[PDB]
Amino acid sequence: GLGYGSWEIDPKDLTFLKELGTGQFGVVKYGKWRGQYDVAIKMIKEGSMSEDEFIEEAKVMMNLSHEKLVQLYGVCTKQRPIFIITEYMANGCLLNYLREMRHRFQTQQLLEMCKDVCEAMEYLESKQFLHRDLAARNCLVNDQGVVKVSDFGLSRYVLDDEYTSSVGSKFPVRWSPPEVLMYSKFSSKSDIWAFGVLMWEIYSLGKMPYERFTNSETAEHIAQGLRLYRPHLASEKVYTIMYSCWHEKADERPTFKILLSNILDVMDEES
Ligand SMILES: CNC(=O)[C@H]1Cc2c([nH]c3ccccc23)CN1C(=O)c1occc1CNc1ccc2nccnc2c1
């Protein structure tokens, strides 16, 4: 209606039902839009984000749509806190989901999680869009067990310098290739690297990558050409796929299209 562009949701259309989580970015709530449609309402913590930049980016992000990418529905920008309105993912964080041993996952399910993410990432790569912080903690799981990629690109707007710089205490060192750690070279291939780590996290049922190392030690390990090694649940073929993401030379890492092809081949051969 009047006073709300195509990217703007009227927050008066929201019904708040349950709190989903709280952290440094703000608070996520489960709710309804116009009494009917499930949504997540992501409430941006005041002072945490470069808000005008985020809002301008949100307008572009409205055009991104893929069944394995958490759908952005709009933003609420007229009051503080700012709201991001997205698709609701009832089973929450992938990292926590993986760590719940009750699921007793088959490896076919683990590969399907990898495929879900790979499809979303191929889509983002086709649009020349980087995630910039791909990891199990930034994937979500819906009521049907489908994994979708969440908060893609959000790190560009985070004001906490501990998060954003390669030498910061909250920087995703364990998901970063040597060229990121050494000289902040972000590219498609740093997303590829992170995706390999994410496959590792999935097959490890949510273990911390390099769990016995600090971030500093991890950076040294990977600068010396050393790597994560094969999760017990990963077949040789699955391990080959994740390991291909970790070539020292960024140009020798696959694309998401190639990874997707590889994953599908393994599903045909093994699942
Ligand atoms: C560092 N972390 C955070 O500060 C909070 C708040 C938040 C996040 N991202 C933001 C972006 C903009 C504004 C505030 C935030 C991430 N975060 C979470 O609690 C969170 O992270 C993963 C899962 C959860 C909580 N559970 C769910 C469950 C179902 C969902 N469905 C759809 C969408 N998000 C869901 C979250």
Please tell me the distance between residue 28's alpha carbon and the centre of ligand 1 in angstroms: 5
Strand order in the sheet with 92-93: 92-93, 139-141, 147-149
Long-range contacts of 23-28 (CB under 8 A, 24+ apart): 24/48, 24/160, 24/163, 24/170, 25/49, 25/154, 25/158, 26/81
Residue 28's CB is within 10 A of a number of other CB atoms, namely: 21
Q: Which numbered atom of ligand 1 lies nearest the CA of 28?
A: 6
CA pair distance 109, 114, nearest whole angstrom: 9
C-beta separation of 61 from 153 below 8 A: yes
Give backbone dihedrals phi and psi of 34, rounded to 5 degrees, phi first.
50, 45
C-alpha–C-alpha distance, residues 188 and 184, integer Å: 13
**Among candidates 7, 42, 39, 29, which has minimal Cα distance to 154?**
42
**What whole-number distance in Å separates Cα of residue 240 and Cα of residue 256?**
15
Give the position of tokens 């090694």. Answer: 229
Q: How far apart are CA 71 and CA 91, in angstroms?
A: 16
Specify which residues 37 forms β-bridges with: 33
Torsion angle (degrees, nearest 10) of CA 100, 234, 263, 192: 80
Tokens of 16: 């708040």
CA–CA separation, 131 and 150 (whole Å): 9
Return contacts of 99-107, CB within 8 angstroms, 24+ apart: 99/205, 99/206, 101/205, 105/205, 107/203, 107/233, 107/234, 107/235, 107/238, 107/270, 107/271
- The residues near 52 (Cβ < 8 Å, ≥ 6 apart) are none
Task: Compute the CA torsion angle 218, 223, 225, 230 (nearest 10 deg).
Answer: 20
Q: Are 152 and 143 in contact (CB under 8 A)?
A: no
Which tokens belong to 47? 């002072």
The resolution in angstroms reads 1.3
Three-class SS state of 37: strand
Nearest in space to 121 (alpha carbons), one of 57, 70, 62, 160: 70
Which residues line the pocket of ligand 1, CB cutoff 6 A?
A: 20-28, 40, 42-44, 70, 84, 86, 88-89, 92-93, 140, 150-151
Consult the annotation and say whether 23 binds a ligand: yes
Written as six digits, the tokens of 53 are 């930049």
How far lies 41's CA from each of 15, 69, 81, 234, in Å? 10, 16, 11, 36
What CATH number should be reported for the domain whose range is 1-88? 3.30.200.20
CA distance 10 to 237: 49
Residue holding tokens 């009521």?
A: 143
Q: Is 133 a catalytic residue?
A: yes
From CA 269, how far away is CA 271, in angstroms rounded?
6
Cα(246)–Cα(225) distance, rounded to whole angstroms?
A: 9
Domain ranges of the chain: 1-88, 89-271
Residue partners of 180: CB distance under 8 A and separation at least 6: 166, 186, 190, 193
DSSP 53-121: HHHHHHHHHTT---TTBPPEEEEE-SSSS-EEEE---TTEEHHHHHH-GGG---HHHHHHHHHHHHHHH
- Identify which of 60, 113, 64 has the alpha carbon closest to the alpha carbon of residue 87: 64
Closest-CA residue to 114 (of 198, 181, 33): 198
Q: Is 14 annotated as a binding residue?
A: no
The structure's method of determination equals X-ray
26 carries a ligand binding annotation: yes
Output b/e per residue, 105-127; b: 16+ Cβ within 10 A.
Answer: bebeebbbbbbbbbbbbbbbbee
Q: How far apart are CA 66 and CA 58, in angstroms?
A: 16
Name the phi and psi angles at 137, rounded to 5: -60, -20
89-271: CATH topology is Transferase(Phosphotransferase); domain 1 (1.10.510)
Identify any residues that bridge with 75 across adjacent strands, giving them in sequence order: 8, 84
Q: Which of 25, 28, 44 to mutate to test the pocket of ligand 1 (most atoms within 8 A of CB)?
A: 28
Count other C-beta atoms under 10 Å from residue 184's C-beta: 12
- Pick the catalytic residue from 13, 52, 116, 133: 133
What is the distance between the alpha carbons of residues 67 and 114, in angstroms, rounded to a whole number? 14
